[PDB]
Enzyme design. Structure first.
Site, mmCIF file in Angstrom:
data_model
loop_
_atom_site.group_PDB
_atom_site.id
_atom_site.type_symbol
_atom_site.label_atom_id
_atom_site.label_comp_id
_atom_site.label_asym_id
_atom_site.label_seq_id
_atom_site.Cartn_x
_atom_site.Cartn_y
_atom_site.Cartn_z
ATOM 1 N N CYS A 123 73.685 27.263 76.118
ATOM 2 C CA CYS A 123 72.707 28.195 75.568
ATOM 3 C C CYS A 123 71.411 28.047 76.363
ATOM 4 C CB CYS A 123 72.470 27.931 74.078
ATOM 5 S SG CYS A 123 72.009 29.390 73.113
ATOM 6 N N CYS A 151 85.051 29.794 76.582
ATOM 7 C CA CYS A 151 85.198 29.168 75.277
ATOM 8 C C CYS A 151 83.948 28.325 75.013
ATOM 9 C CB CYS A 151 86.475 28.315 75.242
ATOM 10 S SG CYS A 151 86.891 27.882 73.524
HETATM 11 ZN ZN LIG Z 1 70.748 29.081 71.102
#
Ligand SMILES: [Zn+2]
Length: 151
Positions: free
Chosen positions: A113, A136
């Site tokens: 992220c 994934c």
């Molecule tokens: Zn995040």
């Protein structure tokens, strides 16, 4: 890093920039979700499971409960068949980040992220052409929301 992140609601044709995750520990109990706060202690689930179902459709998007930012337009998800947290393309490198490697013998890029590189997972060249990559990701991040604010 004190950057700001674009959020391109690609399938909704929107663009909304938001700041990076810069909070103090005190914010993470009053601006977080009534699920993010608990997930913040339990990395998703205190018991090893709490049910067995997966009863959804292609509406909504993913929203990283581990920083409060939204991303994957659900055509870049699965739902029918297995609904797994694995997919074959993405919204953009906007709230998600890759680094290429060849770590299977072909193409194995990491998937983290871009606002909270906590765990997520990776992408591997493994599906049918053209969208034959296989992302994934595996964390507590994986809450859904309605597509944006249509609900
Ligand atoms: Zn995040």
């Amino acid at each position: 890093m004190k950057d700001r992140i674009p959020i391109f609601s690609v399938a909704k044709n929107r663009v909304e920039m938001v700041e990076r995750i810069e909070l103090s520990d005190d914010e993470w109990r009053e601006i977080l979700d009534p699920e993010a706060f608990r997930v913040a202690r339990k990395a998703g689930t205190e018991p090893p499971f709490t049910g067995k179902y997966h009863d959804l459709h292609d509406d909504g998007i993913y929203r990283c409960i581990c920083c409060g930012t939204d991303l994957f337009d659900s055509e870049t998800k699965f739902d029918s068949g297995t609904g797994w947290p694995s997919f074959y393309d993405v919204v953009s490198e906007h709230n998600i980040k890759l680094r290429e490697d060849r770590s299977l013998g072909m193409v194995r890029c990491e998937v983290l992220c871009a606002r909270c590189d906590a765990h997520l997972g990776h992408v591997f060249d493994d599906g049918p052409r053209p969208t034959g990559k296989r992302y994934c990701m595996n964390s507590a991040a994986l809450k859904f929301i309605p597509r944006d604010q249509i609900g």
